[PDB]
Each structure stands twice: as structure tokens, then as C-alpha cells.
Amino acid sequence: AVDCALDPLSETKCTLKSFTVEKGIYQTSNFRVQPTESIVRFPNITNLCPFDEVFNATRFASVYAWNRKRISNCVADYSVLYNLAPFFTFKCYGVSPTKLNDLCFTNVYADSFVIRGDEVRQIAPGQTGNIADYNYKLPDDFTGCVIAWNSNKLDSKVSGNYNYLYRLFRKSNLKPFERDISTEIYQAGNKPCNGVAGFNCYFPLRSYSFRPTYGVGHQPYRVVVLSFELLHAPATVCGPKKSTNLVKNKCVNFNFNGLKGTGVLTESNKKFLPFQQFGRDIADTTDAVRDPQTLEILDITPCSFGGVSVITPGTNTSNQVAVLYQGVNCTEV
Amino acid sequence: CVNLTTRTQLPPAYTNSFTRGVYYPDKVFRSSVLHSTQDLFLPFFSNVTWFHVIKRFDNPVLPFNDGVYFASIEKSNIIRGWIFGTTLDSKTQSLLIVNNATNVVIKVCEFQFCNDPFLDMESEFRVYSSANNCTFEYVSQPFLNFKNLREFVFKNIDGYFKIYSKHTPIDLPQGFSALEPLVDLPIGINITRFQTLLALHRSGWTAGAAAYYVGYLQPRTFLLKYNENGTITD
């Protein structure tokens, strides 16, 4: 047996896959410097932002007039979005619905409405049907989450509810995130309908008429869609992570506002100007960052690394080796 | 407001733009690098519409196809603000930007104007007759032959209204001048037409002459050069 981490001769044997090494110079591996500490930097915003009244609301809007709300400059918490109901559907595209407590987003959009029971599958990327092309359309590069839950005990009534409407007739399919509130009559025929009902003149709205008696696949469902935008920005909104003091001139691993890395942070001389947040290099990688608690610029440089070679005669003659470190001045090994 | 029939029909002048309308398209720092971008820019060597104001009144209504490059050569600050909208009445939201004495105010809501809106040393500020509840308001520090050249770029995309600006002391001249981003606004409106605003004061009396140029933006691919600092030089 041979231990591949005892001495350079053993490493050479382990690389060559042999118990005898002949005369020559062999390239064994590379040497790096490991991190010692760990820091996390997040913005100092501590207030919360509206999530209770988005879900604990009295009346949601119809499908064709879906309610839109913008969420920014807060601290998001998603633990409270667990006990909505005994059973509910929670599907996230582009993110996993367990890791969105340590991610920083630019702007959050919340769209709320109420849908027929069996049409929940139609709120999805690139799906066709009745509401996905005439009421609510989603893009093909969506990055967000969809939540749906039962609303029989609250919405359906015995006396009769007719306050929820959808649209059935339209010229062309809707652009994503586009709303229509027109009531102009349909023109299937060749003659004008002069704003009166008749054949080929249909009013492009319809009612649900929910009653507590229909089958399990027909009761109303409440649907809310969350849209994110994970890009480069001041990062107005993100969740509950505790900050830590920053260190300099030491190889550590860092998490700057959602950007994870390892390296050495140094005071910067770049000529940033107000709107510039971070910088790049020739190879399209991050080089400079701006600390979101002091508004100062730091430069990132990976800590020392290099290549190691072993010079030995044949194992038949001796077991002595010499080590060559490539491209380094060994006053700074 | 009053109605007059003394206007003289005359088409606005047409001039050309050589190398103007270059702005930083991203929020990232690059030094001494040639980069390629694909965005809504102003085509090089393109004709633009020139209006001259001194009497003669020229505040037409112009479309808002994709974006606006608005340039003003001026002295003594006659051009004041901007109106943006779709129908310009109380039936749709309208955006309004006015430069105060020492501030700038931006607001988006319904308004009411005359057929030829105008502004009346400033003591009276009467541009709109009515104003209902407004969604977004904003107040900020003031944006500030002919001796002042002001260049502005107005864009509206991704549910954001973007204002880029640049000022210079000096028939547009040659040279290169990049435009730094100034304001982003989360408005989300329809926007189809716009109209400028100038300041007139009753007063022998001499009226400062001003000229302003309007150009339209199109999607194009550009190759930009960043020098040792974060300055676009070509």
C-alpha cells in the first residue's frame, strides 16, 4: 500500500500509478491557500413589507382585472407562507421553494386573482387554453412562484354569487403581462351589431355561479403569482440574514448581497461614479464590489496558487527528491 | 385661455446629427475595453427636427414611437419642463415634469390643459386647471449666441421610465459626449405623445432666442470603447 499524502515521492507514485519511479521530472499537482474566516454582508433594512393583506384579503379581483402589487425596500420572510391551508399547491420555476430565504431580489411583483377549479394547471409557462390566452398570459422565461389554495368555504354561497367574470371571445392572443378591460361587442358577422345583442353579437363576459354543491374539481381556487427579477441592481428587497464585520488582506470566503466567492479583499483605486455598483474584467468576471453598508469599493483577488514539480532519480538508486515551485519568488511561498 | 388665428404656417427645419446620443446602457464598470451592445440607440448621421422659438409660438404635439432624444441650445433658461401622455385629458394618466425655482417636481396623474398649453422671473404657476388624486409624486434637486447645450434621453421600457441627461457649455456641433443616467421611475403607463414647455414673461424689450431638436430612437448594435477610466470616448 501507498499513502498519497505522506511525502512527494508517494504523491508521484500515486499519480503515475506505479510502485517504481524512474529518473526524470514529473508534474504532480497544484498548491493553493485555504480560507480561514467567513463573512456575510447584507443591507441594514429591518422593516417588513406587506404580505399579510395580500393573502388575508377580503375580496380578490376577477381574472380579466387581476390585481397587481409592487413590493420593494423591505425584508422578505417566507416562513409565514406555510400555514395558508391544510393543503395547497406551491410551484416555483427558476428557484427552489426552500432556498429563497437567502437570495436578494431587485423588485417583487404580486398578481392575485381567482380561477375555476380545474384551470389551475393553465397558470404555467407556455400553456394554451381558455384563460392562458384570453385572460392571463405568462412569458416563457418566467422566474417566480405560483400559489393556489381552496376557497369553497369563503367564496361560494348558497344565495348565488355572480361577481366573478372571465373573457371568452377576443381577436388575438394577449401579450404577456398585458391586461384588457374593453367591453366593445364581438363582430363575428359581416354587419355591425349597433351595440345590441343578437346572433354573432355576443357579450364577451361570462359568470361562474359557484354553489357549495358542485364536485371537488369545480369549486373556486385562489391563485397568487410572485414574479422576481434576479439581475444587477441596488437590491432593494431580500430576507433575514445576519451581517458580520468585514476583513481585509486575508483569503476568506464572502457573500456580498447574494454574490458568493472566495479570495482577498483590498482597498480599491478604481474611479467609480455614483450609479456604478460593481465591475468586470476582460474575461467577464467580477473584479470590484461595493459594500452595501459603507459605500466603498473593494477589489477581489484570488489568493496564492501555483504548480509543483518533483525531481528525483530512479527509486532503484535513492529515495531523495527535490521540489520545484513554478513561477513564484520563494521569499513569498 | 383665448383663441387666436394669427399663426403662420411654416414647416420646422430639418438638420442632421453626427455622433450624438450615446449613453451608458448598463450599471457595470469597465476600463480600457471594447464592448458590443444591442439596444435602442440613435442612428449615426440621422435627420432630426429643429424648432426655433423667440410672437411666434411653436409647441406642437409629437409622437413617442420608442424613445426621444431631446436637445436644447439656449441661454437664460426659457425651456422649463415636459408633459407626457396618451390623450392629454382627464380620461388617462399623464406624467408632468416641472423645474421649480430651486427644485424639480415630477408627478403622474390626471390633469386638464387648454388646446395650446403654456406657462405664464416667475410669480404665477398656472399650467393645469384641475388635478385629481395622483399615484406617484417626486421632488428632487434641480437638473441644472447661445451658451448652454442640454441633452436628454427619455425611454420607457420594462415598466420603467428612464431619464438620462448631460449638460455642456459651448446646427449642432461635432464631438463625443456620453450621457450618464439620471432618474428611473416605476410608473407603468401607456404613453404615446408628448409636448414641451417654455417660459414667457411680459415686458426696448429683448426676447432670448432658443432652439430645440427632436430625434427618434431605433434598435441598433453598437461597439463602444472604454478608456482607462469609466469614460466612453468613442
Next chain:
Amino acid sequence: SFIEDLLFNKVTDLICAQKFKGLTVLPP
């Protein structure tokens, strides 16, 4: 020599960027 010097003179930050990706150049 003179001709060798002329020939040597005739033929002539990116290196650091390449090195930080793991590509190096060895000497003769």
C-alpha cells in the same frame, strides 16, 4: 551581433487575467 540585434528588435494586464483562469506559459 548587429544583424542579430536588429532581428531581435524587429519581432515583438491580459497575462494576469489569463493566469487567473489557469493558463500559464513555460520558459525554454
Next chain:
Amino acid sequence: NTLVKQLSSKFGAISSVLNDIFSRLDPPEAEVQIDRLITGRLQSLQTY
């Protein structure tokens, strides 16, 4: 230079960097993106 510039490709994945892929998706799903990136980079280096 072209070998260095190939590092910004996506090869059909959701991003051109690895840390954000590992910090946004669960282990069951990040494997496809990691495989795509690894295969693309291996092919580029082999061609070189």
C-alpha cells in the same frame, strides 16, 4: 484569448456561473445545469 472568452457561454443552462446555480436550485435539479456547463467547457478545451 478565444479559450478564455469561451467561459461566458451558457450552453443552454440558466446562468454562466456556478455559485448562483448552486445557491438557487435544489440538488435534484442543479445537476442538469452543472452537466451542461461541464460538458461544454470540456469540449472547448479538447478542441484547443
Next chain:
Amino acid sequence: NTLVKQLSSKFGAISSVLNDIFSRLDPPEAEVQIDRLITGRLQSLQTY
């Protein structure tokens, strides 16, 4: 001849013709089929 003939192989997708792939089924799997075809054709060009 072999370069031309390589255009009529599935590479593991439903069909060689891509408009049928787009029309028959949804974008989520059409993306995978398109990626398979693109990778195969690029590999053929590299070999040539």
C-alpha cells in the same frame, strides 16, 4: 455527402424536422429537443 446526410438523424429527439417538434408539444420539452439537435449538428461540423 456524410455532412449532408447527418442532417436527417434524431440525436435522441422525436423527429429531425424542428417545426413538427415546435407544433406538437410544449416549449418545456421542445427546448431539450432543440438543444439535442444543436449539439449534434455542432459536433458534426467540428469533426468535418
